[PDB]
Write a protein that binds this ligand. Structure first.
Ligand SMILES: [K+]
Ligand SMILES: [K+]
Ligand SMILES: [K+]
Ligand SMILES: [K+]
Ligand SMILES: [K+]
Ligand SMILES: [K+]
Ligand SMILES: [K+]
Ligand SMILES: [Mg+2]
Ligand SMILES: [Mg+2]
Ligand SMILES: [Mg+2]
Ligand SMILES: [Mg+2]
Ligand SMILES: [Mg+2]
Ligand SMILES: [Mg+2]
Ligand SMILES: [Mg+2]
Ligand SMILES: [Mg+2]
Ligand SMILES: [Mg+2]
Ligand SMILES: [Mg+2]
Ligand SMILES: [Mg+2]
Ligand SMILES: [Mg+2]
Ligand SMILES: [Mg+2]
Ligand SMILES: [Mg+2]
Ligand SMILES: [Mg+2]
Ligand SMILES: [Mg+2]
Ligand SMILES: [Mg+2]
Ligand SMILES: [Mg+2]
Ligand SMILES: [Mg+2]
Ligand SMILES: [Mg+2]
Ligand SMILES: [Mg+2]
Ligand SMILES: [Mg+2]
Ligand SMILES: [Mg+2]
Ligand SMILES: [Mg+2]
Ligand SMILES: [Mg+2]
Ligand SMILES: [Mg+2]
Ligand SMILES: [Mg+2]
Ligand SMILES: [Mg+2]
Ligand SMILES: [Mg+2]
Ligand SMILES: [Mg+2]
Ligand SMILES: [Mg+2]
Ligand SMILES: [Mg+2]
Ligand SMILES: [Mg+2]
Ligand SMILES: [Mg+2]
Ligand SMILES: [Mg+2]
Ligand SMILES: [Mg+2]
Ligand SMILES: [Mg+2]
Ligand SMILES: [Mg+2]
Ligand SMILES: [Mg+2]
Ligand SMILES: [Mg+2]
Ligand SMILES: [Mg+2]
Ligand SMILES: [Mg+2]
Ligand SMILES: [Mg+2]
Ligand SMILES: [Mg+2]
Ligand SMILES: [Mg+2]
Ligand SMILES: [Mg+2]
Ligand SMILES: [Mg+2]
Ligand SMILES: [Mg+2]
Ligand SMILES: [Mg+2]
Ligand SMILES: [Mg+2]
Ligand SMILES: [Mg+2]
Ligand SMILES: [Mg+2]
Ligand SMILES: [Mg+2]
Ligand SMILES: [Mg+2]
Ligand SMILES: [Mg+2]
Ligand SMILES: [Mg+2]
Ligand SMILES: [Mg+2]
Ligand SMILES: [Mg+2]
Ligand SMILES: [Mg+2]
Ligand SMILES: [Mg+2]
Ligand SMILES: [Mg+2]
Ligand SMILES: [Mg+2]
Ligand SMILES: [Mg+2]
Ligand SMILES: [Mg+2]
Ligand SMILES: [Mg+2]
Ligand SMILES: [Mg+2]
Ligand SMILES: [Mg+2]
Ligand SMILES: [Mg+2]
Ligand SMILES: [Mg+2]
Ligand SMILES: [Mg+2]
Ligand SMILES: [Zn+2]
Lengths: 150, 138, 208, 235
RNA sequence: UAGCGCCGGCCAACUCCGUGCCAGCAGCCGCGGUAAUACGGAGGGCGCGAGCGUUACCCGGAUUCACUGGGCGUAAAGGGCGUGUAGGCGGCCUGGGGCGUCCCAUGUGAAAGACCACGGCUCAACCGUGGGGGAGCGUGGGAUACGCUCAGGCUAGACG
RNA sequence: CCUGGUCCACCCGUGACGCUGAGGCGCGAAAGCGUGGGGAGCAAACCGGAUUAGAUACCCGGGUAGUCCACGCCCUAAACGAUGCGCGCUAGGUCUCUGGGUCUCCUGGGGGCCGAAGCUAACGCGUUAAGCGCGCCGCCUGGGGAGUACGGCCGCAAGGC
């Protein structure tokens, strides 16, 4: 019912009297490939707990994507921190052309053909957040004419 | 003085909507009024009207916003998500009819100043004339 | 090159049972029916989570080794498909299926694709009457792929077409067993092929 | 429901400073350096707010009353001790809504200790525990007095001062819970979903608004109750 | 006839022995001082295949000279300050011109190449035939919103 | 005494006369140079006393250029808000300097603090923007080599660009 894929898993370290102590963080995307996505970043002393916590947080933070024949309705451009994401719709038969993070996020959203570009900072966390905000700032023609009813 | 009165009006609209103002007054001119006609026609604003401040004529632009949203940040969605001047003084942008951009693949507009008046991207394309790319709005 | 050598080791490495010998990949002797792990000393060991490049490369290698086409012709066909208008993957599959050796295999004249390649290269196959000995020959819709009149007395063709009695052919092919010929009706659709390959993975592999 | 002219002492707001510009729409004028609430817009918003309250009450919903300003504690502790809407009185604990499960575990411990003091198990495990658990139950009843009635998340919250109770407001926003609040000039009206532009310092304003609100609540479920015994709390 | 490179990460492919900061490897991070998936050999594997590697050079990634498409408080970066020349830029209204701008028509844009289709060498490479193009510039005609120019007017900028 | 800038009130006059500004030109702390003068205190160099393993230092006693003045040079800096100038737009609160006014307060200019929206890598900025815009100039393109070499221009020299 819900597909789950991890973006990256890292081990951070805090200093304490005696040495360094490690804590694992993990990004996880969840999607039904029908138009709903979810991104989560979980931290835990061990890797499996971090993955499970990231899955929970991802399922808690969902985004409804307005797919239009497997692609996006309009080109977007989002700056999250120093990381820029550029999305652009593509005709079918093109495929998803993106970095690892945006490819995973868009594939779990149900996108089949899209053109992307990462600019500025290539940080996977910030790129993921920028892609999520990009999918969140998507508007359909129905939404546009709904905002201009008056 | 104002170096670019049109960009000044666009920035007034932007700064007004960003704080969810009721209306904003811009120093009046026929060019700005002809642009505001396109704005109110396309539904980005509730409308405009000529007004008078202490001695001088202005234009009150009445802004438009979406419904109040739920959860944190209940501020409504902006009707004018983006409004940017293109053909600025010092770098003027003129495009042919085959060079008129399609803003947001249709969901936006591009205001042009052509020999047949101030039109939109689709309006000028239907008329078959190009001109100065004033600004992009979506 | 043609990779000539062991074949069922690809049945094992690719993780999906391939049919490179024709028979003996259906019989309990494929070594995939009894040894599903990859070849080598480190085949039975616990496999690590492969990278995305690993997945795409393995899928492309599966699709390529199914037809036995070298990397040169394979990449050329993919670029040709990407140049054309339409979905790249389905057009690529239609191009691969349009090869003369693969058509000979699909028409039941040969039990395997490499046996079909040898049958073509030795002039035992004709196209519209004229003898053709090129496996890379592209068959157009309407071409009549026949067997050489001088080769219809050979034992292997007798066997293969004697076993083809009653067997159905692909929806895009017709077969006349008595006359030992067939027709390429149309380009096959994606639904017509049951290949265990995700074409989008190969498109993404060449997108890099 | 007849509070048209009886609004005696509600229009008084805070001083010229310590205000919020977003409240300017609900302000009539400034008399002697004190913001006075617009009397018309007060009832204008009261119509919609009390209508939402009636709709939510006749449907059987639960409303959480939050008051800590030390001028509405004794009022909220009984206006909610009327029709079974819960309340938070002494202080608003961080996570009462977003971490509702842990606070419900605390409530489980509260009723557990109530069951221990109801069973003859008080004498065993001698006086040390008989004092520790006594003080524990004391503070649990002190903090979870009205909160113990919430079996699930509430359908709405009622606030006396959304600036003093800003944490509860934020938690309600996070969970998409409607926010009813008696706002004053020192609060941001955008965060409040159903605003009641009155006074939060005076006792008569709070008593009037909350009494009429609980009366509307019981009127929506039938069985009109007698006037609330909160007048004696004028002192 | 089957060979060549690789198997620490980037990057697809792991074990044994030898060696002991030695001998060496290395595009970048880096590996070796006793048990090295990184050196050397072996077995096995991965990748291509009459080729496989290396070096050199060009574009790419590189939004890293940022027109599209970057920056300058603390990361490289605001001139020590002013006066002011050239230059760049120019508030509101009306009119004339039509230089910029835009539109139509037409000429030009050799062939080959590129794109598309069909066809010829058994296919392909290669080649033939046909089709479609296209900025720019010339000419004739037209448009005047904006920029420009000229003439006049206004007082919100500026000065008194 | 001579003299520059600036702010406010009146709404009086001119009628876009505006903004910026490559070059050019002028000003430019301290130190330093030239000529002349002055020289109390201070004080590079220097003469000593201590300290120290040594003490070309810190500490102590002296002390010249200099610091000062006139005139002429020199063009540097953590010349700092490490933030070019101008105009417009975008919540407020508080402290303060300076006007005007119906002088609880309002309004205008200036100096601070806290903070809306927003921005920022963060610290922080936030009507005195580092926000939103427009115009023009200056400058940056990894670190060392190196603000060095060469050439030029300037300077008496030190040396500067
Ligand atoms: K941003
Ligand atoms: K023969
Ligand atoms: K050796
Ligand atoms: K080795
Ligand atoms: K002397
Ligand atoms: K500097
Ligand atoms: K005064
Ligand atoms: Mg949506
Ligand atoms: Mg940035
Ligand atoms: Mg970068
Ligand atoms: Mg990098
Ligand atoms: Mg042109
Ligand atoms: Mg349509
Ligand atoms: Mg294609
Ligand atoms: Mg294509
Ligand atoms: Mg690997
Ligand atoms: Mg090597
Ligand atoms: Mg190299
Ligand atoms: Mg050894
Ligand atoms: Mg060893
Ligand atoms: Mg090894
Ligand atoms: Mg080997
Ligand atoms: Mg080569
Ligand atoms: Mg390169
Ligand atoms: Mg480039
Ligand atoms: Mg690029
Ligand atoms: Mg470079
Ligand atoms: Mg640029
Ligand atoms: Mg940069
Ligand atoms: Mg400066
Ligand atoms: Mg000039
Ligand atoms: Mg000039
Ligand atoms: Mg003008
Ligand atoms: Mg001019
Ligand atoms: Mg005219
Ligand atoms: Mg012309
Ligand atoms: Mg040509
Ligand atoms: Mg090309
Ligand atoms: Mg042919
Ligand atoms: Mg043409
Ligand atoms: Mg002409
Ligand atoms: Mg005309
Ligand atoms: Mg004039
Ligand atoms: Mg004046
Ligand atoms: Mg006047
Ligand atoms: Mg006059
Ligand atoms: Mg100036
Ligand atoms: Mg200058
Ligand atoms: Mg000086
Ligand atoms: Mg001096
Ligand atoms: Mg001297
Ligand atoms: Mg002297
Ligand atoms: Mg002395
Ligand atoms: Mg000494
Ligand atoms: Mg010592
Ligand atoms: Mg001694
Ligand atoms: Mg001394
Ligand atoms: Mg002396
Ligand atoms: Mg001297
Ligand atoms: Mg300073
Ligand atoms: Mg400075
Ligand atoms: Mg710096
Ligand atoms: Mg400044
Ligand atoms: Mg001020
Ligand atoms: Mg601050
Ligand atoms: Mg903020
Ligand atoms: Mg902060
Ligand atoms: Mg500013
Ligand atoms: Mg350097
Ligand atoms: Mg260098
Ligand atoms: Mg240096
Ligand atoms: Mg120097
Ligand atoms: Mg020199
Ligand atoms: Mg000289
Ligand atoms: Mg010297
Ligand atoms: Mg020296
Ligand atoms: Mg020097
Ligand atoms: Zn097999």
């Amino acid at each position: 019912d819900f597909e789950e894929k991890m973006i990256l898993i890292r081990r951070t370290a805090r200093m304490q009297a005696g040495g360094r102590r490690f804590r694992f963080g993990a990004l996880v995307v969840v999607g039904d490939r029908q138009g709903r996505v979810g991104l989560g970043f979980g931290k835990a002393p061990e890797v499996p707990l971090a993955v499970q916590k990231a899955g929970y947080y991802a399922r808690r933070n969902m985004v409804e994507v307005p797919l239009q024949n497997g692609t996006i309705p309009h080109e977007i451009e989002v700056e999250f921190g120093a990381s820029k994401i550029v999305l652009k719709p593509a005709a079918p038969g093109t495929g998803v052309i993106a970095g690892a993070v945006p490819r995973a996020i868009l594939e779990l959203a149900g996108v089949t053909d899209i053109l992307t570009k990462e600019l500025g900072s290539r940080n996977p966390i910030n790129i993921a957040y920028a892609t999520m905000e990009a999918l969140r700032q998507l508007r359909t023609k129905a939404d546009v004419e709904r905002l201009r009813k008056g | 003085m104002l170096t670019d009165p049109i960009a000044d009006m666009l920035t007034r609209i932007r700064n007004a909507t960003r704080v969810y103002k009721e209306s904003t007054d811009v120093p009046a001119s026929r060019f700005k009024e002809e642009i505001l006609r396109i704005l109110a026609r396309e539904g980005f604003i509730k409308g405009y009207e000529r007004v008078d401040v202490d001695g001088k004529p202005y234009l009150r632009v009445y802004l438009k916003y979406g419904p109040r949203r739920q959860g944190p940040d209940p501020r409504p969605e902006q009707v004018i998500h983006h409004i940017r001047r293109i053909s600025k003084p010092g770098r003027r942008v003129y495009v042919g009819v085959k060079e008129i951009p399609r803003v947001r693949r249709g969901l936006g507009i591009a205001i042009l100043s052509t020999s047949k008046g101030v039109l939109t991207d689709r309006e000028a394309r239907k008329l078959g004339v190009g001109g100065e790319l004033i600004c992009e709005v979506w | 090159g043609r990779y000539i050598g062991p074949v069922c080791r690809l049945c094992r490495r690719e993780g999906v049972k391939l049919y490179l010998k024709g028979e003996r990949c259906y019989s309990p002797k494929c070594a995939m029916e009894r040894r599903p792990y990859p070849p080598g000393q480190h085949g039975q060991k616990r496999a690590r989570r492969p990278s995305d490049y690993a997945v795409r490369l393995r899928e492309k290698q599966k699709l390529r080794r199914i037809y036995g086409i070298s990397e040169r012709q394979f990449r050329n066909l993919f670029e040709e498909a990407s140049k054309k208008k339409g979905v790249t993957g389905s057009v690529f599959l239609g191009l691969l299926e349009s090869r003369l050796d693969n058509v000979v295999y699909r028409l039941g004249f040969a039990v395997s694709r490499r046996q079909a390649r040898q049958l073509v290269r030795h002039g035992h196959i004709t196209v519209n009457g004229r003898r053709v000995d090129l496996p890379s020959y592209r068959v157009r819709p309407g071409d009549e792929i026949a067997v050489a009149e001088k080769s219809r007395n050979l034992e292997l063709i007798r066997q293969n077409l004697e076993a083809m009695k009653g067997r159905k052919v692909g929806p895009w092919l017709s077969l006349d067993v008595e006359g030992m010929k067939g027709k390429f009706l149309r380009l096959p659709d994606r639904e017509d092929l049951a290949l265990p390959v995700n074409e989008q993975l190969v498109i993404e592999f060449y997108s890099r | 429901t007849v509070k048209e002219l009886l609004e005696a002492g509600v229009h008084f707001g805070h001083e010229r400073k310590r205000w919020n510009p977003k409240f300017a729409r609900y302000i009539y004028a400034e008399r002697n350096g004190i913001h006075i609430i617009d009397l018309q817009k007060t009832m204008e918003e009261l119509e919609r707010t009390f209508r939402f309250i009636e709709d939510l009450a006749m449907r059987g919903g639960t409303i959480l009353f939050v008051g800590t300003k030390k001028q509405a504690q004794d009022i909220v502790r009984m206006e909610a001790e009327r029709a079974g809407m819960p309340y938070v009185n002494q202080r608003w604990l961080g996570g009462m809504l977003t971490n509702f499960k842990t606070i419900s575990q605390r409530v489980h411990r509260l009723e557990e200790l109530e069951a221990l003091f109801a069973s003859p198990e008080i004498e065993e495990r001698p006086k040390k525990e008989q004092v520790r658990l006594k003080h524990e139950l004391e503070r649990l009843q002190k903090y979870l007095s009205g909160f113990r009635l919430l079996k699930r998340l509430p359908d709405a919250i009622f606030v006396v001062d959304p600036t003093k109770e800003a944490i509860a407001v934020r938690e309600a926003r996070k969970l998409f819970i409607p926010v009813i609040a008696l706002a004053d000039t020192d609060s941001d009206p955008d965060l409040v979903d159903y605003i009641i532009p009155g006074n939060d310092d005076a006792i008569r304003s709070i008593q009037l608004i909350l009494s009429r609100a609980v009366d509307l609540i019981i009127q929506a479920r039938g069985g009109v109750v007698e006037p609330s015994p909160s007048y004696a709390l004028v002192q």
